[PDB]
Amino acid sequence: KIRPECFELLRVLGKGGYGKVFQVRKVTGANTGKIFAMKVLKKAERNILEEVKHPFIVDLIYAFQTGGKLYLILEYLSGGELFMQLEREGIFMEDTACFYLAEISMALGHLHQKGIIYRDLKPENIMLNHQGHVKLTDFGLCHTFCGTIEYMAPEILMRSGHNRAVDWWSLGALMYDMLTGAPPFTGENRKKTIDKILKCKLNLPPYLTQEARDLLKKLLKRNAASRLGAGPGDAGEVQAHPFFRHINWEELLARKVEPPFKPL
Numbered sequence: 001k002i003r004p005e006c007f008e009l010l011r012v013l014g015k016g017g018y019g020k021v022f023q024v025r026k027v028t029g030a031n032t033g034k035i036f037a038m039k040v041l042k043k044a045e046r047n048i049l050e051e052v053k054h055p056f057i058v059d060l061i062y063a064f065q066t067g068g069k070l071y072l073i074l075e076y077l078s079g080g081e082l083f084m085q086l087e088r089e090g091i092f093m094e095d096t097a098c099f100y101l102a103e104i105s106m107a108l109g110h111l112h113q114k115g116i117i118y119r120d121l122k123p124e125n126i127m128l129n130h131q132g133h134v135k136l137t138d139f140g141l142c143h144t145f146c147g148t149i150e151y152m153a154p155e156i157l158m159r160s161g162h163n164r165a166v167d168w169w170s171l172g173a174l175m176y177d178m179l180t181g182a183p184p185f186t187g188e189n190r191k192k193t194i195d196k197i198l199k200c201k202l203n204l205p206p207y208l209t210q211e212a213r214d215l216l217k218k219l220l221k222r223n224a225a226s227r228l229g230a231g232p233g234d235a236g237e238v239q240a241h242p243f244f245r246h247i248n249w250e251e252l253l254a255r256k257v258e259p260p261f262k263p264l
């Protein structure tokens, strides 16, 4: 019943992996006129999206294959890349960063509960819904060195086996990027960047609060097993940190906390 011609294309939202993502309008059904995003993959990701149900992870609405293509219909996230906020702000105040990192952490917990690893928390991959809340959305295939590797754990870069700990590293890299204006370890070229990540000689800016510095130091560690969040408490361990002292969690999850930016 549901099929590719139930939607008209409005614009291209992005290429990536081996697919296109369109903003579309549904023209049939009760949801006639309702707006969505549609990822078209030219014949995994669908399984992850089917399994998840979290306020901070994107909703899969319809999925189907017809012809060669595989079609995933996802909620439209008019809020945009979190990346665009950071780009305009230059550097987030810790209040701002804390909000986003707090929501991302609950999403990360949910995924790890399902045995899912996100690998790469680059801010271009974090989307915002219309209210300005966090949505993890891209669980596609793209392949490790194809894009930027600056938010990835060293044990991912030198393929030596890894688990959910890589995600807490990436949270720290992102946090560093939010607070300083660039990711922790940047080379002049590719090879020099990689080496800098492996050596993991962390440079804490003197201006960050003690809480902000201590969380960064516990997240960005070469030894995966000893990262905050690498332990059995996973996201709870991280959410416990005094950097997240003002975070009413039950309300954050309920999306009753107001985001630092309303894309509007």
Ligand SMILES: [Mn+2]
Pocket: 142, 143, 146, 147
């Ligand atoms: Mn690739």
